[PDB]
Amino acid sequence: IDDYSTWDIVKATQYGIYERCRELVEAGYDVRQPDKANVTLLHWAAINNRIDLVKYYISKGAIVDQLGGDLNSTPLHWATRQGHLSMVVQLMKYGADPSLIDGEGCSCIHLAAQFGHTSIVAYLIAKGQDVDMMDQNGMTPLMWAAYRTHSVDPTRLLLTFNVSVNLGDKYHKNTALHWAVLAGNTTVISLLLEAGANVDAQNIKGESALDLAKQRKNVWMINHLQEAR
């Protein structure tokens, strides 16, 4: 029978073994000391939704928005990627900044959009983040949703807000519709057309969304887009 007295601090954090973590910290483990992957204990507590460990580590002076890992992200980024609304709320109550960008150029609303975490997207918008916030690559949450979430939400949720459906990203000028067409995201195409996506708006290479549909020889996408012109 394993009683966790031999587990190291990282593994005990991941699994939420509260008393093991506390005894190691009191025996001298610095809560700010990263592991060999440049990841802090707060990161592991956040991505495994360890609410109480998160309070404890922060009360011991853990840096709330410390960048770590290969993607160079805050603990709140990690929680957002993983989908823990309770952790996102908790970290933002202790002052975590949802607008910080990670090493892929994304702030939290973009991360929540691209991994389909609809209630986190709604929460960030409810807390004031702009629905059309651009990340470092010029992507909006709606573009990320079109590109990466082949599902009704979070796209349906984003369109309940005064979104500007025809913006293009900064370095391609691809609209959300362009992205949905590139990705073959047929669920999202109908929602964007119903929301007013212009099928002829051209990107930086002069291709419209309908041009991209023709290129892919997808009759369903060509038909749907043409009937909305």
Binding site: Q14, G16, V39, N48, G69, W78, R81
Partner: peptide
């Protein structure tokens, strides 16, 4: 399972 790997590039 728990999360024991850091987030990675897609």
């Amino acid at each position: 399972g728990v999360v024991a790997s850091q987030p990675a590039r897609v």
